[PDB]
């Protein structure tokens, strides 16, 4: 089933690229994406940012957040987060369910091990853009 998971993962990277808005501040962005490390005391700003990329437009305009599936969060991480520190970024996002479970009505919260091995996989087959391939992002920065 992994191919479907992978399929849906890449498919989300395409959506992410159509950012309409990002809330982050130049800095928060220098925080999501840098090589600079996240100490435990940063885990919350980490979540603000990763979350800011997962629910972004919804927030900006005023629609409520609804739960995003794992395959999507993996894209968000693989695409925006530096490799140094994908672990904490996954540690802090554990919980969401895989589309399949959502579809099937089964509760399968996802723990750390999973998000990390999955995103790590996505990152490897996602030359869709590194982020590197798009300076455009900084256009959709904030305000």
């Amino acid at each position: 089933e992994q191919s479907v998971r992978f399929q849906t993962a890449l498919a989300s990277i395409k959506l992410i690229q159509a950012s309409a808005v990002l809330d982050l501040t130049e800095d928060d962005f220098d925080f999501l994406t840098s090589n600079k490390v996240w100490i435990a005391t940063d885990r919350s700003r980490a979540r603000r940012c990763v979350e800011a990329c997962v629910y972004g437009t919804l927030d900006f305009v005023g629609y409520p957040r609804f739960p995003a599936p794992v395959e999507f969060i993996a894209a968000v991480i693989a695409y925006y987060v530096h490799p140094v520190n994908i672990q904490t970024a996954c540690l802090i996002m554990e919980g969401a369910e895989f589309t399949e479970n959502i579809i099937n009505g089964v509760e399968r919260p996802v723990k750390a091990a999973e998000l990390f091995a999955f995103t790590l996989r996505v990152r490897a087959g996602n030359t869709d853009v590194l982020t590197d391939a798009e300076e455009n992002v900084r256009q959709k920065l904030r305000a």
């Binding site: 992994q2 091990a113 091995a117």
Partner: protein, 175 residues
């Protein structure tokens, strides 16, 4: 003096003879013999290592039936190569949804505290690996792997692994 009753690794009371006779070190490290359940000791008195660049390993399949994510895995081995290959050893953890024959693409490596001496290598140390599968369909495996840029040579020895999922008893006469 009092007898020590603790050890880093406990071997299975029943050892297996490697049936194969030649391995060819590779990036897709071959699995010397089909993985057994939770513990197995494998011994070979003549394994011909062909020339290659990669490694060969020995498996044990994590018995994922007790509710506990992190468990202790042990490995104890004494291997002697006819020539000094200048290889590094390590415990590996790779999962697969099928009986593996070769170390897949994604695997993890952990340092062991053994001792090298030219063509020799002995070890008895343990490491805690997350034995539950990181991906739904799989089975997770742990094994001892030697890896280098091999030149044809041979090696003798045994390599045994055990997964601490239960303790073994032993006569402590003072009880």
């Amino acid at each position: 003096m009092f007898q020590t009753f603790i050890s880093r690794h406990n071997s299975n009371f029943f050892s297996d003879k490697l049936v194969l006779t030649s391995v060819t070190p590779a990036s897709s490290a071959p699995v010397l013999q089909t993985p057994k359940a939770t513990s197995s000791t494998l011994y070979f008195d003549s394994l011909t290592v062909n020339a290659g660049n990669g490694g060969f390993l020995h498996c044990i399949q994590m018995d994922t039936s007790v509710n506990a994510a992190n468990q202790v895995v042990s490995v104890g081995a004494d291997i002697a190569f006819d020539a000094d290959p200048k290889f590094f050893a390590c415990l590996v953890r790779f999962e697969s949804s099928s009986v593996p024959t070769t170390l897949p693409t994604a695997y993890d490596v952990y340092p062991l505290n053994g001792r090298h001496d030219g063509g020799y290598y002995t070890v008895k140390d343990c490491v805690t690996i997350d034995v539950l599968p990181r991906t739904p369909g799989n089975n997770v495996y742990v094994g001892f792997m030697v890896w280098s840029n091999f030149t044809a040579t041979k090696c003798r020895g045994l390599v045994s692994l055990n997964q601490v999922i239960k303790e073994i008893i032993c006569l402590q006469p003072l009880k």
